[PDB]
Structures are given as C-alpha cells and as structure tokens.
Amino acid sequence: MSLFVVNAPGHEGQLKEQLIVAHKRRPLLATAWVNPPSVLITNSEGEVLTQVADPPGSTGRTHQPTALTWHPNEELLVIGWSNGEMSLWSMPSVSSLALGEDYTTAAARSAVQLIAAKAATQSSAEGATREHASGAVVASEWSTRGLYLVSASQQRHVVMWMLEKIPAETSVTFKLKPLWSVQSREPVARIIHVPSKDDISFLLADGGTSVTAINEDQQLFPCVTQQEQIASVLYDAATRTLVTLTTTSMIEVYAVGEDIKGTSTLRRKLSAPATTPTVSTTTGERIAMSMVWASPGVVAFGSGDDRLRILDLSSGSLDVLLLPQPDLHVSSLATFAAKGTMIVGTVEGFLVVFQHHAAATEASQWEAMTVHQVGKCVDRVVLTALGDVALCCGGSELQVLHEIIRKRAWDGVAAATQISSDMVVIESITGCQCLLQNKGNVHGVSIAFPNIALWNGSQIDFYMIDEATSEITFINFVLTTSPAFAIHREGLIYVKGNRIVFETMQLAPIAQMTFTESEGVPVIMDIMNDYLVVVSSKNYLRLARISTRDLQQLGPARPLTFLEVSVSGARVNAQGRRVALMSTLGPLALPDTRIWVYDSDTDKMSFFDFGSRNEIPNSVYWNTPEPNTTTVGEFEYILLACETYQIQRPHNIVTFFATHDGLVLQNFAPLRRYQICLVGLTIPDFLLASVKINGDPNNAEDYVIEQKRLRDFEGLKSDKDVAVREALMKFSYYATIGNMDEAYRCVKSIKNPAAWQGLARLCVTSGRLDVAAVCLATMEDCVAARALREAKEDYPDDQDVQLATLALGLSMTEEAVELLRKSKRYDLLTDVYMACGKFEHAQRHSERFDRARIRPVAYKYAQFMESLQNMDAAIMWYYNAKCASTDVPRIFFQTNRMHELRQLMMGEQQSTFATIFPQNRELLLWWAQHSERRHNVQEALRFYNAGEDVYNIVRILCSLTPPKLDSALQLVNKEMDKAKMRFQQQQAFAATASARFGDDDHGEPDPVGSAYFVAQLYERQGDDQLALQYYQAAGAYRSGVRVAWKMEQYGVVANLAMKSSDERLMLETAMALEK
Amino acid sequence: MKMCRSLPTSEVTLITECANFFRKHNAIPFAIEAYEKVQDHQALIGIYVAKGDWRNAFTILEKTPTLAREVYVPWATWLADNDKFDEALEAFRAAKWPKEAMRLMETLATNSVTCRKFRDAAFYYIHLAEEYGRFEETEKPTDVEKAARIRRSKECVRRADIYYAFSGVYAH
Amino acid sequence: DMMQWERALTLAEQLAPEEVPIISRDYAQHLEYRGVYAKALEMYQKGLRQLPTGHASTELSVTVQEVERHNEQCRQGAARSQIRIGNIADAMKTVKESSEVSFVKECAKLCEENQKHEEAAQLYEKAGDIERAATIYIERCKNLKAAERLLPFIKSRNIIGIYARGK
C-alpha cells in the first residue's frame, strides 16, 4: 500500500489551528505561532523556508498575527496582526535572479525557492492601523483574480484594498491601498468572494443569522435571511450555490443568481436527538461544525459523531457513509478536488482517506483507502497544492504528512521493508531480522547484502552489516538529490548532477563520462544481478550490463510510446532483456491502472490494465534468481508479479508471463489482513513482510517475512528440487498459453503428484477428459476414476456432467452449480448439496426450485438421523417423506417399541407425534395388516374400516365363518355405485360432442375387484349363475368363463372372451368351442 | 363488441384479427365470444390454457379429438408444478413429448428406489423400458442408437423383475 | 485405472475372453504418447475376432459395424506404428487399401526419414496435395519421372526452375 511521512518543523510556540493556510497553486504553507508570536512559512513538505516577526520599529510589542491569506497565483502572503498593521511577505521570483536555465528539476526548484524565501521581504501598508483603528484583523480575503483584498476586524471595520504591482528597476514590489471604510453589525468571521461567471463583490458572515454582501456600490446588503444563527457558509462559484448549515443542523441550500439573492431549494427537518448530548467539556467550547465541498454537486458534513453525512444537491438526497469502525469523533474535514479525495480527521488520532471510485449505490462511490493512526488529537486539517496534508495536533503541535509508497527491496539474500518515516526492517531467510532507525526520513531503499543504502533526499547513507557481530554502523554519505540510486556488489550507482556516478564502498570512481542536456538527467534506475535499467526525465530508456570493471550499455538510449503519462518505476528481469514499467497519469502523480512490459529483443511495449479487474497496482516484481544459483531456467526469468488492490482494502497478487505476444495472466492470489504487502518474488515464493496472525499490526517489530507458495507450486517436498521445479514452471507457462497437448509433456518428467493434480485442474477448466482420465489414474484416485468411468458410461451424450464429476473428484465443489446452473441439472446438484452435509441448504433449495425431489431429501435426512441413533427426528422425517407406510413401523418394530405404536394406534413432546400418527391412513392400513396376520381378525376389521380399504374388508368378511355375506354385498354394491357414477359422469360429459358425432364407444364402468370374493362365495355355494354376474362385475373374465362352462353355454363364453381383450382367452376357447 | 356482432359469419379472418386485438388488450371475454363465433377451437384452447380453466378446454377437446397435444402438454406441466408427478407422467405419456416423460420417469423411478418403494420402482422401470423405444417423429435414430436403447430396455426389464421379486422378501 | 494392462489382460484371459483385445488397444494408445510403441503390435494382431453368428435380426446386425470400426482403428494404429519399425512393405497394402485422407497424410510424413522414398512418393501424390509433393520431390526425392505426370497440375514456377535444370 502506501503511507504518510510525517515532518514536524520543530517549534515550541503555541500554534493557532485557525491560522494554517496553503497557497492553492504554489506548494507553500504558512503557519502562525504564539509564544513567541511569529509566522513560520514552510514548503509543502514541512521544511522551514523562513520565519517572520514584526517589522522593525516595535518598542517591544511583538504583535500577534491574526489572519494570513495567500495570493491566488503569486507567491505572496498578507498578514493581519493584532494591532491592525497589515504586513505583506513577498519572495523574489526565480526568473528575477537571472541564473542558469537548467532549473527545471524539482530539487533545484526547491533549493532556489528555499534561498529566495531566505531572500524574501516584508512590507507595511501605510495607514492600515488607522483604518482598522488599532483593531485586530480578524479576517482577510483576496478576489478570485487576486487584485482586490478585503480586511475585516473586530471593531466591525471592513476595508477594501487595491493591489498595485510596481515593477522596480531590479525586482517587483507590491502595495495595498485602502478604498472604503465600512462597518458591519458584528465582527465578521468568514469572507467569501463571487466571480461574475475581475468583478469585485464579497460576501461576509459574522456567525449570526444573516449574511451581508458588499459590492462596488459600497452598500452592505443581506442575501439570505435565516431566523437562527449560522456558523459556516459554503460557496460554489461554478454553480454559485450557497449552502448554510444552521447551528441546529438544518439544511438551507440557496441558489444565488446575479442579484446576489439566495433562493432556498432544499430544506427538510433533520431530527438529531438531544438525549444526553456529548457536550465538549474536554475543550470547554462548543463543538465545531464541519462541512466542505466533497464533489461537484455533492456536499459532505461530519457532525462530530461516529458517522459521516453526505448530501447530493443534484437529487436532494442526504445519506450516511460510515467509517470502517464505530467510535470515531470527527473533528475537522478537508477534500482534494484534484484526486477526488476526502481527508477525515478524528479526535482519537485517525486520518481516513476517501477516494472517488471514478478517480450500484451512490454512497458506495466514496470508499476509504487508508487509515493512518497518528495517535494524537487533530485540531485542523489543511491540504496543499500537491496533495500533502498539514495537521494541527495538540494546539501547539504541527505536522505535515506527505503521501508516498512504501519503499522496499529484495536483493536475493535479504528483504528490506520500510515501516515508518525512518524505521526500516531488514530480514533475511536466515532469520536475520533487525530494525534500523535513520536520522532523516526514508526516501529510497537499495540492498546488496550486507551493504544497504538508504537515501533521505539530501544524501544517501550506505550501512554495512557485520552479521558475525550483527553490528550496523554509518560510514560515509553521498550528498546527492536524485531519486535514482542503486547499490550492488560491485559498488553504488547514483546520479550526481548530469553524471551517473559508479563508485565502490570507499567511493572509488569506476565509470565517469559527462552527460549532456540532450541526454538529460536520469530519474529512475534498477539493479539486479548483473543488469541495470535507467529511465531519464524524458522517457529515455538505457539498458546496461554491469561488470567487474565497466558499464556496458546494451544498445543506445531508447524512447517509449504510451494528461501525459510519466514513468515512476521499472524492474528488469534476470536476463536483462524485459523491463516492467509502472506508469502514472497527470502532473498530480495519479496512479495508473495499466502496467507496461518492454521487450528489447523485439523492442515491443505490451501492456495490461487493471481497471478491467477494478484494481489499482502498487508495485511490480520479476522472479529474482537465488544467489549462487545460475542454473535457473529461462522461462523462470520472465514471470512477473504485481501487487494490486481493488477500488482494510482487499489485497491481490497477480502473476503474468511476459511473453513476446503480450501479457498473459497466470493466476490471482488474495492476501489476508496480516499479510501487509509484497516485498519480493523468488520462485516459488512471494516474500511478504507481514505480521503475525495473533500479533500486533501496530507493533513496528512484528514485521516477519513469509514465503507464500505459488498456487501452482504445491507439494514441494525438496527445496533443492531443480528439474521438477523447472518443468513445473514450464507447465505453468504452457497452461497460461493453454494448448495443453504439450503441457502434458511438460509434466512427464515430474513425478510429484501435485503437478498431476494441477494438470487435472487445468483439464477441468479446459474441457479435455482423455488426458484427465490418465491424470486421475496416475495418482491412483480409484474413487474419482471410478466416478469418471461411470459418468462416461451412463451419461455419454453430456460432457458437462463428466466435467462436474471430475471437478468434484478434485476437491473443488463450488463449480458443480456453475457448470449447468440454468440449463438445468437440479438433481445432481441436490445430491452434491446433500453430500457436503448441507441438508438444510438442499431442502430449502429444492422446496422453491426443485419440487420433484423433496421426498429423497427427506428420506436421506431420515436415514442420516437413524444412523445417528436419534429415533425422534428419524421417525418425524420418515413421516415427512410420505414413507410412513413401511419405515416408521420398521423403526418401531426394530427398536422393540411396539407398545408405544399400539398405544398410538389405540407428555408435551408426545403431542407432536399424536397430532399426526393416529389418523395416518397408511398407518391404519399397516396396523390392520399387522393384526390380521397376528391372527387378530376383528382388530384387523376395525382398522380396515378405519382405513376404508374396501378390498381387504370384503376379503375378510367373505373369509369369516359364517361369511357376513350381506355386508360384503352392501360394500361391493356401494363401490359399483361409485364406479357407475364415474362412468356415467364421463359418458354424459362426452356425449355433448357425441350428439353430432355418432360414436359407438362401448365404454364400461371400472370393475370392482372386491366383488371377486363374493362370486367365490357363490362359486362355493352352487349359485354359479349369481356368481357370473359378480365375476363380470369384477372383470374376472377367466373366472367368468370358468363359471360359464357348467351352464353348457357358449355365447357368454364367446362374448366374455371378446371382452377379455387378451389373445390367449380366445386362442384356447376357439378349440374349446370346436369340440 | 358492437361492430363484432355487426359482422356476419362470412368474414372469418376479420373477426379472428379483432379477437387477437381483444387478446392483446386483455379483453379476454370478447376474444372468447369472437373465437366462439368463428369456432376457432385452437385460440379458445390457448386462451383457456393461459387463463386457467380446464373444463372448458376439455369440452373444446371433445369436438376436436385431433387437437390433443396442445391441451395435454400445458396440462402436463401444470400438473408437474402442482406436485402431482404421477398424473403429470401419465399426461406426458398421453401427449408424446418423450424427453420430459423420460426425465420425469427417471426421477420417479429413482425416488422409488431410494425410498425403497420397490413395487413402485418395479412399475416405473417396466414402463420405462417400454418408453425407451419412444422417439420424436422429427428424429429417425440410427441402428447404433436403437441398440443403445434396446440394451437399456432389457436392463430396465431385468431391474423391474428384480425389484418386484425383492419387494415381498424385504417386507417379510 | 491402475494402467497395469498386463495384469488386466492376465486376469481377462480367464474372466472375460471377449474383453481381452479392447483393453489391449487402449494400452497401445498410451504408448503412442511416449514413443515406446515398438511393443504395440502383438495386441493389434490379437485384436482379431470371429464374426457373430446367429439370427439375421438387428441384434446381430448393429454390432457388426462397431466391431468393424474397432478393427479399422486397430489396423490404422498398426499401420502408423509399423513405419518406424522398418516394415513399410507390409504396411503399404493396408495403406493403399484404405480410403481415409488424414490417415494416409499422417502415414506419408515419416517415410522419408527411413530413406524409403518410393513409398513416400506413392503416398505424397495421393495425400491430397501436389504442390508440397513436388516440393519434396525437387528437394529430397529428385525423381523427375513421377513429377512429369504432375507437371500440368502445378502452377509453382519456382519449383519448375529447379526441376528443369536436370530435365
């Protein structure tokens, strides 16, 4: 990620939080300190430029500055003191000094602005004390074009000042002259200006109920009128909007036209409860209201609570975007329009940085990037021109936080990581983990173990580690200012002026040829092994090879083709051929969502963007070959790793193969919360300077290195395994290419089965199975091979199911649904959902989505409970599965709980059982059969009549001695009645269209099987004529003709044979009739 | 409606078009009246299927026996989504469409096997073997596919015999 | 799934005599990917099988086509494997009695390396392309008699410019 470097220009004076100002375009910053009363003017990095006191003439009255304002385009400050004297601080311009024209780099500009600030001047406006009448200047303000000034005092005096720029014979001076002397009703607090789209017109707010504007007509007139006290007024010049948040926190947005009159557009009551308010007693003052312009059209305010309240003036919508934690008291707020970033300061000592997504829901557009715990209460927050953020801490304390990326390096032996402004943790693979503190802040890190050079802007100090004693001591410094420096075993290579100087540890010069302005000043350099890359300030690329004696430039200087797109970082591979390039966008050093790869052999520049992945990168790294290991493979040299984070942020590490054809993505790798970042790459491991899982991220000493394995480098039993590792890297490359036919041969040399598993995963992702069968069967996963063979044999037409089976056999389970999700295979994913133990997911999935297999889910859960020996849930789910006809009696009979079943058929939780059990018709039928075969005929009859099973009842009644013939006849005729009813209903329903359509459909009612026994009774009583009618009524055509034989009848025989509609029944009765 | 009943029975197509206009603008009863006046049985069946009434659909089916499929198929899927899967299977058996009949019979035979309803599984498999010879009229299978389904027919007959025999033994 | 096809065959000797050749062919396929198919001939010769005798119904009819397809694939594999052994003359009868364009194209590539240029020349003109056949003719074979018959069917004058030097 990234962090702030904190520079505190030391002074024991009491800073006023209300009097820190920043030039809006020039990178400067002015502060007012009390005891002693003075003004420190510093640059944008907190480095002191000058200190200002009262101009001479004071008889010991060192007056107290009360207001400071900047010129909107010049390096000019004006200071209103406590006595009304209006001083003006002016630095001479660089072009006025008539020095050389090479002053175009940032460091030279910083040095010349430092010396010019030391050569600045202070002037006094004539009669300014009288115009304010010895009153302290409580406010001042320049116009938008910055030639009109307005000064307001505590005596309500408001004075307009005309700016006169007097070009002197050798310099330029400035004067401020009074124009008007008007009076307000109260001491005016905030003065705003309005542009016409020059025009002189200033709004004034004294913190009361009404705001008073003044224009060239010398008239002080109100614009908006409110009945409650106002505190802060937000003005938007582009839309001229005037937003006022009342002391009671009520929204009042006024559109303001040319008439300088505010018209309210949105004003809705906000209910902020007054139940035990948190009155600020620690400070002894009213809580400061805070609102600023978050985005064009959107205004944010924090109410001092744990919440942040955003308001969209375009749609009138007010919502809340919360901080990542509760318990954060917001004190001051600021926003950088250049990056679309809000800075949230908390009393607890936190700065939260919110980034525009374009820099779903509208509130998701903002998101917090970094949380920086300063550990001190912040008073005021002021941004600068470049984005550096100044804070007022503890009243008398001031800090300047400048946002940088964390410097880190990995030579091959030890990794160096920056953790603070000046704390650096150096950690080897031998456990040599130690922390070092520098005099100044860390700006550049380079390592060639045990030599390690840190650059602090003004100079580089290279430290030597004696690991035998583990002692580190400064030796000598190289006073240079370039960001380009890199240490090596041969020596240190840096930039002095235009020269790129190569020296030894004792600074013995090695290569020295003077460069020109056309070649320019190198800004970026990278050293690894015996190769170096230099990128100048003009996009020029110089590859080079470092040797024992010289710096052989591998070819000439080259340009590259991409507001403007600059270059901030470059890393060359171990072949010294491909260079990875980090680009930025715009002069604001905005990060870029794409990364670049330059191949010198084909001299191409390919690229890959991360905005497609909604990601922003931070660093890129090649595979560093191990020290004293020159047998590393060629492809192993070309793998590139990039650290990315999405827009506690997510972390990802993405791998690429820098082929000639472009960048081919290999794999992503999310990082955990303790895994802070990536410091190095050394195959097969990402080397991360993380913290312990249970450790303290706040601790600076808990930065331990972790060698996270590459995802396609699993099962590495041997760290000296060379051929297997090289062939695995070749296989990974071929998998990224994809055409797995020779990726099959990439792993034959490997006998590590983890490579076979990775190849099988690739076979799943591709869709090739004949390779995958061998991939399974060479690991002897006979379960998965058996499953694949069965899937091929039973589902030969479908290949997606075989792919899903293979994926399941490879211990990846989320893919089965994704394979044939909507094209429907709900049964198989139901089985998979059960097989993961997620019954409570499978049943709720199938209830809404797959209605055909609720019963198998219930039956499987019942078997699961029965194998758990919980007969309660097992019995209730065998009931829920509609299988209680055979399985609930099974459980009761095999648990020997038959007494309870008899009790149920003829305790709070027993209510649930007895609610359902006694009336289950299948249970009644089963108990009837049970008692019937238990030689209890009468209980069987009772339970059959309770279960209305007509057939069994008729069988029993015709079987009893004596046969209860009349009740059997009654029930048989009742069922014949119902069958006749159904046949007549369907026939009369069909006869409507049969009125016109003559159909000889000789349909018959459904025969009643229960009649059979009745005919049997007459068959046992000689009433065969009666039996024949019931046999035909039963559909017993064979028994019908069996009866019909003894009548010496043949017509009934023939027609019953016809009605049988089965070939045998006429096939034999033919020659039965012939005899 | 007034202009609809102004029209005679000769201009059938115009009344069908204005009944379509009724149907697009959810004038369901007017569409019913117009389709009735032009005795457009297919549109009556379609609008009743979309509506939900089935008795009227079958009354229309009685006059025209040759319009069976377009009534049974939505009837079959309605029975299927009303969890009456045996009835839906019978309806699919009536109205050809062997793909959905195949799938539903697979699910039902599997449910009978896993829930140990061995008589039900035997019935499902013995009729599933008979269904394995059912193809859509648009597709004429090769002899290879005919053999690949004859083998499954014989296998399912064997499974049906085994399950039907095993039901009584398991019960005992 | 053990790929011990040797013991698979060993138990298939007494368990399933009919399953014996099929596994065999699969064995040879794996050898195809490793170049050790010098032993991948005897199982192809053992892949023969007597015709199914029975009633003339579909059941005895459909299987014939599948078993014949298996025989054709086995003979294709045998012809492919016999090239590097040095038995081109035996394989030529099977190759020239075949019809598949791709199989003959794959067989024609490897005949030049064994310096058996006559069979390579016979296969190149029937491989479906004549331009590459004449290119191999003028660079390696140097047989102008066969190229004379292909002269009206080639428009490549750069081939002719080297062809006509010794013609």
PDB file of C-alpha atoms in Angstrom, chain A residues 101-208:
ATOM      1  CA  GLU A 101      18.216  27.827 -17.287  1.00  0.00           C
ATOM      2  CA  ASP A 102      18.764  24.257 -16.056  1.00  0.00           C
ATOM      3  CA  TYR A 103      16.460  24.862 -13.053  1.00  0.00           C
ATOM      4  CA  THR A 104      13.679  22.529 -14.171  1.00  0.00           C
ATOM      5  CA  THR A 105      14.035  19.558 -11.808  1.00  0.00           C
ATOM      6  CA  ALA A 106      12.094  19.506  -8.552  1.00  0.00           C
ATOM      7  CA  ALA A 107      15.141  19.564  -6.269  1.00  0.00           C
ATOM      8  CA  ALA A 108      16.733  22.603  -7.920  1.00  0.00           C
ATOM      9  CA  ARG A 109      13.404  24.430  -7.719  1.00  0.00           C
ATOM     10  CA  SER A 110      13.165  23.502  -4.036  1.00  0.00           C
ATOM     11  CA  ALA A 111      16.675  24.811  -3.352  1.00  0.00           C
ATOM     12  CA  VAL A 112      16.143  28.071  -5.227  1.00  0.00           C
ATOM     13  CA  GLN A 113      12.769  28.621  -3.554  1.00  0.00           C
ATOM     14  CA  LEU A 114      14.485  27.999  -0.216  1.00  0.00           C
ATOM     15  CA  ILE A 115      17.166  30.605  -0.879  1.00  0.00           C
ATOM     16  CA  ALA A 116      14.601  33.042  -2.308  1.00  0.00           C
ATOM     17  CA  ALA A 117      12.419  32.591   0.774  1.00  0.00           C
ATOM     18  CA  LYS A 118      15.548  33.386   2.763  1.00  0.00           C
ATOM     19  CA  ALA A 119      15.837  36.435   0.467  1.00  0.00           C
ATOM     20  CA  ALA A 120      12.172  37.453   0.826  1.00  0.00           C
ATOM     21  CA  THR A 121      10.877  40.754   2.206  1.00  0.00           C
ATOM     22  CA  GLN A 122       8.191  42.237   4.442  1.00  0.00           C
ATOM     23  CA  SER A 123       6.333  45.482   3.719  1.00  0.00           C
ATOM     24  CA  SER A 124       3.791  47.545   5.655  1.00  0.00           C
ATOM     25  CA  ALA A 125       0.630  49.097   4.245  1.00  0.00           C
ATOM     26  CA  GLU A 126       0.508  52.812   5.012  1.00  0.00           C
ATOM     27  CA  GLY A 127      -2.211  53.975   7.384  1.00  0.00           C
ATOM     28  CA  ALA A 128      -3.634  50.463   7.773  1.00  0.00           C
ATOM     29  CA  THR A 129      -3.600  50.727  11.573  1.00  0.00           C
ATOM     30  CA  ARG A 130      -5.694  53.905  11.449  1.00  0.00           C
ATOM     31  CA  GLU A 131      -8.252  52.406   9.052  1.00  0.00           C
ATOM     32  CA  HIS A 132      -8.772  49.441  11.368  1.00  0.00           C
ATOM     33  CA  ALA A 133      -8.472  51.942  14.277  1.00  0.00           C
ATOM     34  CA  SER A 134      -5.962  49.724  16.123  1.00  0.00           C
ATOM     35  CA  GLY A 135      -8.259  46.701  15.774  1.00  0.00           C
ATOM     36  CA  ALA A 136      -7.098  43.133  15.224  1.00  0.00           C
ATOM     37  CA  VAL A 137      -7.588  41.899  11.659  1.00  0.00           C
ATOM     38  CA  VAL A 138      -9.995  39.030  12.251  1.00  0.00           C
ATOM     39  CA  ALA A 139     -10.358  38.174   8.559  1.00  0.00           C
ATOM     40  CA  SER A 140      -8.942  38.902   5.125  1.00  0.00           C
ATOM     41  CA  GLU A 141      -9.650  37.662   1.615  1.00  0.00           C
ATOM     42  CA  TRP A 142      -8.354  38.089  -1.933  1.00  0.00           C
ATOM     43  CA  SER A 143     -10.525  38.178  -5.022  1.00  0.00           C
ATOM     44  CA  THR A 144     -10.651  35.282  -7.476  1.00  0.00           C
ATOM     45  CA  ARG A 145      -8.280  37.130  -9.808  1.00  0.00           C
ATOM     46  CA  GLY A 146      -6.459  38.446  -6.747  1.00  0.00           C
ATOM     47  CA  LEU A 147      -6.167  42.200  -7.137  1.00  0.00           C
ATOM     48  CA  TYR A 148      -8.812  43.202  -4.573  1.00  0.00           C
ATOM     49  CA  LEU A 149      -8.361  42.448  -0.876  1.00  0.00           C
ATOM     50  CA  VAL A 150     -10.828  42.798   1.990  1.00  0.00           C
ATOM     51  CA  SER A 151      -9.827  43.065   5.647  1.00  0.00           C
ATOM     52  CA  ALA A 152     -12.387  42.825   8.450  1.00  0.00           C
ATOM     53  CA  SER A 153     -11.637  43.500  12.110  1.00  0.00           C
ATOM     54  CA  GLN A 154     -13.283  43.007  15.498  1.00  0.00           C
ATOM     55  CA  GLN A 155     -14.397  46.659  15.551  1.00  0.00           C
ATOM     56  CA  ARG A 156     -16.702  45.689  12.635  1.00  0.00           C
ATOM     57  CA  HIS A 157     -14.432  47.700  10.328  1.00  0.00           C
ATOM     58  CA  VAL A 158     -14.328  46.354   6.772  1.00  0.00           C
ATOM     59  CA  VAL A 159     -11.786  47.861   4.381  1.00  0.00           C
ATOM     60  CA  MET A 160     -11.303  47.146   0.682  1.00  0.00           C
ATOM     61  CA  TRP A 161      -7.726  47.247  -0.608  1.00  0.00           C
ATOM     62  CA  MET A 162      -6.477  47.751  -4.150  1.00  0.00           C
ATOM     63  CA  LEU A 163      -3.342  45.848  -5.154  1.00  0.00           C
ATOM     64  CA  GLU A 164      -0.663  47.772  -7.062  1.00  0.00           C
ATOM     65  CA  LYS A 165       2.170  45.764  -8.627  1.00  0.00           C
ATOM     66  CA  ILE A 166       5.153  48.104  -9.023  1.00  0.00           C
ATOM     67  CA  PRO A 167       7.943  46.704 -11.236  1.00  0.00           C
ATOM     68  CA  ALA A 168      11.136  48.013  -9.652  1.00  0.00           C
ATOM     69  CA  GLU A 169      14.348  48.600 -11.593  1.00  0.00           C
ATOM     70  CA  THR A 170      15.713  45.220 -10.435  1.00  0.00           C
ATOM     71  CA  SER A 171      12.694  43.434  -8.896  1.00  0.00           C
ATOM     72  CA  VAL A 172       8.914  43.645  -8.412  1.00  0.00           C
ATOM     73  CA  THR A 173       7.231  45.112  -5.323  1.00  0.00           C
ATOM     74  CA  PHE A 174       3.595  45.247  -4.260  1.00  0.00           C
ATOM     75  CA  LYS A 175       1.436  47.736  -2.383  1.00  0.00           C
ATOM     76  CA  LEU A 176      -2.041  47.560  -0.863  1.00  0.00           C
ATOM     77  CA  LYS A 177      -4.036  50.760  -0.622  1.00  0.00           C
ATOM     78  CA  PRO A 178      -7.341  51.356   1.194  1.00  0.00           C
ATOM     79  CA  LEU A 179     -10.505  52.202  -0.721  1.00  0.00           C
ATOM     80  CA  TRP A 180     -13.525  52.069   1.629  1.00  0.00           C
ATOM     81  CA  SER A 181     -14.093  52.009   5.389  1.00  0.00           C
ATOM     82  CA  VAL A 182     -17.491  50.485   6.159  1.00  0.00           C
ATOM     83  CA  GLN A 183     -18.973  48.992   9.325  1.00  0.00           C
ATOM     84  CA  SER A 184     -20.751  45.691   9.939  1.00  0.00           C
ATOM     85  CA  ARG A 185     -23.200  44.769  12.667  1.00  0.00           C
ATOM     86  CA  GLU A 186     -20.747  42.288  14.220  1.00  0.00           C
ATOM     87  CA  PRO A 187     -17.120  41.184  13.805  1.00  0.00           C
ATOM     88  CA  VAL A 188     -17.266  39.306  10.513  1.00  0.00           C
ATOM     89  CA  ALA A 189     -15.884  35.764  10.643  1.00  0.00           C
ATOM     90  CA  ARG A 190     -15.697  34.404   7.082  1.00  0.00           C
ATOM     91  CA  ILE A 191     -15.323  36.434   3.879  1.00  0.00           C
ATOM     92  CA  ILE A 192     -16.122  34.773   0.551  1.00  0.00           C
ATOM     93  CA  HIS A 193     -15.817  36.105  -2.993  1.00  0.00           C
ATOM     94  CA  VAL A 194     -18.099  35.662  -6.007  1.00  0.00           C
ATOM     95  CA  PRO A 195     -16.925  35.692  -9.642  1.00  0.00           C
ATOM     96  CA  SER A 196     -19.067  37.021 -12.469  1.00  0.00           C
ATOM     97  CA  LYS A 197     -19.101  33.777 -14.474  1.00  0.00           C
ATOM     98  CA  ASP A 198     -12.444  40.818 -12.123  1.00  0.00           C
ATOM     99  CA  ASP A 199     -15.810  41.708 -10.614  1.00  0.00           C
ATOM    100  CA  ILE A 200     -15.451  42.960  -7.040  1.00  0.00           C
ATOM    101  CA  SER A 201     -18.133  41.628  -4.684  1.00  0.00           C
ATOM    102  CA  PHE A 202     -17.573  39.944  -1.320  1.00  0.00           C
ATOM    103  CA  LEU A 203     -19.964  38.048   0.915  1.00  0.00           C
ATOM    104  CA  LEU A 204     -19.411  38.435   4.648  1.00  0.00           C
ATOM    105  CA  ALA A 205     -20.542  36.259   7.551  1.00  0.00           C
ATOM    106  CA  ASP A 206     -20.196  37.259  11.204  1.00  0.00           C
ATOM    107  CA  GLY A 207     -21.588  33.968  12.506  1.00  0.00           C
ATOM    108  CA  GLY A 208     -25.047  35.407  13.192  1.00  0.00           C
TER     109      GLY A 208
END
